[PDB]
Design a protein around this ligand. Sequence first.
Ligand SMILES: C[C@H]1O[C@@H](OP(=O)(O)OP(=O)(O)OC[C@@H]2O[C@@H](n3cnc4c(=O)[nH]c(N)nc43)[C@@H](O)[C@H]2O)[C@@H](O)[C@@H](O)[C@H]1O
Ligand SMILES: C[C@H]1O[C@@H](OP(=O)(O)OP(=O)(O)OC[C@@H]2O[C@@H](n3cnc4c(=O)[nH]c(N)nc43)[C@@H](O)[C@H]2O)[C@@H](O)[C@@H](O)[C@H]1O
Lengths: 343, 343
Amino acid sequence: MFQPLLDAYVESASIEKMASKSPPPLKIAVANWWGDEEIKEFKNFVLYFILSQRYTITLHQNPNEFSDLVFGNPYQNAKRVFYTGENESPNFNLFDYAIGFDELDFNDRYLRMPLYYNELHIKAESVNDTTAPYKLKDNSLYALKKPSHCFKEKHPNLCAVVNDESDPLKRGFASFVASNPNAPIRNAFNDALNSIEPVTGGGSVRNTLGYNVKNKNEFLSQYKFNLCFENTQGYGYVTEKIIDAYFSHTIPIYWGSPSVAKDFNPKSFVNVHDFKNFDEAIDYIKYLHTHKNAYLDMLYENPLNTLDGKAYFYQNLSFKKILAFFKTILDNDTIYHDNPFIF
Amino acid sequence: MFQPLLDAYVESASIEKMASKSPPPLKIAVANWWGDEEIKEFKNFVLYFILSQRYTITLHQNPNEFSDLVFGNPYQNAKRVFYTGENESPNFNLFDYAIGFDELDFNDRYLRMPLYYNELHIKAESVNDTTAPYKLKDNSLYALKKPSHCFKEKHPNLCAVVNDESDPLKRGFASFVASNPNAPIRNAFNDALNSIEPVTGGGSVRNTLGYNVKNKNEFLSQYKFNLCFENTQGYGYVTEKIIDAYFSHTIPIYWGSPSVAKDFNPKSFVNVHDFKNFDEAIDYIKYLHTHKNAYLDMLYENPLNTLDGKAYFYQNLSFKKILAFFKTILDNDTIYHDNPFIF
Ligand SMILES: C[C@H]1O[C@@H](OP(=O)(O)OP(=O)(O)OC[C@@H]2O[C@@H](n3cnc4c(=O)[nH]c(N)nc43)[C@@H](O)[C@H]2O)[C@@H](O)[C@@H](O)[C@H]1O
Ligand SMILES: C[C@H]1O[C@@H](OP(=O)(O)OP(=O)(O)OC[C@@H]2O[C@@H](n3cnc4c(=O)[nH]c(N)nc43)[C@@H](O)[C@H]2O)[C@@H](O)[C@@H](O)[C@H]1O
């Protein structure tokens, strides 16, 4: 159920504005190779957005300045914050701090931030609309920016099956929107799942349709199931793929993170680790399409777990908690990473 | 200049008003194993649109009904029309007529329709906006509909340089929006063009950003070149790819059709055929790309050719030619496809 999954991130975005518009400044360095179309990504994905409210920012494509937010992986003796999207371990001998998906900890030295807070953020960059279903909090961080109308034309069916101007069981079985081959679990599972009911591909891999899809979310809304396999297996490797399936009034058939039920509710989606073998991963669904009174619940289930009434994110993923990492970052200036003293 | 390419196609779609609101009916057959999101294409590719003004249509996913025009790419002793998009030769033994890409004559049994007639179709239909750069002639087939208002928010970098609000020296070298691997042509010349100066990808194959962009008209305008190669080679096989670089005020670096010059102007895109090899290709581009006076007149250039002043389609491809292509169909009763009799 996406409506709480959006209303929840909004409360995790609950912060206080600043005293004056003398916002404490900041200097940022990145990997050498990133570009304006990837630096607009740097300013558009969720991280710069939270530095956009507390601190003041000016970016640097020159290592000819000494700075505080040094990202990337292209420098030796500086103040360097990690930040990934791919499955990459953290190495605190070259860097200082880390933003990963490891269900880890290193005191004030690691900040697990899965890239499912970027599509969650980013899913709120489209709902600031007059022709949108999912609701923001009034005069919140996202409602403070001017509204638009690019939503009724893009999504006419995703705008439908959610608001109950249409049915969810009068749609199709499974859809496949993977485009990368190096993922043997992601690919193969199209085999088995298909020999029981057709599966629709939309990438370069197992492409069933006939056309390559431009809007990935209008796609799944015409389906009753989405397949959310990551490219590689990783405890915490839960990305935006699950989100683009929750957002689409469909069911994610998830596999990749052997520790996923912490992140989101194991009852609202199909978790493929929750099985002893693979043919049970196919059994779970064949009970749900057929006996609809059981397809409702999972479909009508909250992505998030609950707390004596209240619904939450795992490990208190919030706008604030991230700051109790960066504030401590700015703060202690111990050069943990090996002081580069070549012989 | 996309305006003339926007002026040409539109008046090819000029037909008088309906002299009688009793549009001649017509029942049509299709294939079987597609669905909702796939059969809507038989209404949405370049036939039903033209006819939903002229003939009255009722498609059939039900084989127990009567039809004259049998399309698809999947009954066998009736009147059948061959219609392809892929690479697959004429087949006069299975279907009766042909509606394809080759340069063949079989009297009324061949009509060469390259695929770009369906992107000129849509590229006139995705620009039916109030906030678009390409202004349509008033009160034509598209201007009859209600103008939208979602182009300048989705395409700000496309609307601009056509409204003349940008520098063309200030866009990246080459873009590459292709996601098929088995095409060394579109996988080596890339590296050949790329292992020189960066080429930017926008799919799964030879990617650059680390994401597949859903907006394919805005990506090419943040660059100077598009790599309008084909997967393989074919006479008369012109696709839709060539249009979308023509559409986006960028340059196609083209390969695929050794007769595209018959379709379009060869002094307006970069043609790898008109060279002895690939290594001759880079010399001419380090001119246009770097000798602006060649990137303009080629950007000021009509995609189509001209005929002592005015432009044309190859083989006079128009509505009537296709309209009066089907009249003959409803004319000759002669069974042509291989009469299947078993003894
Ligand atoms: C089978 C392959 O699976 C892959 O990994 P994984 O199974 O985790 O899937 P993922 O790579 O994590 O999927 C990323 C996709 O990115 C999002 N997105 C945003 N805009 C667009 C858009 O405009 N077009 C498309 N197509 N996608 C968009 C979502 O759509 C999401 O679905 C390969 O990396 C390989 O592992 C390979 O096996
Ligand atoms: C390198 C690979 O080349 C391919 O062939 P070819 O080099 O002819 O390119 P083509 O396959 O003919 O390109 C089709 C693309 O379809 C259009 N389109 C419409 N909406 C979208 C959209 O939303 N996302 C994307 N990505 N594309 C969209 C254009 O974007 C166009 O560019 C493979 O078939 C292989 O040959 C392989 O080698």
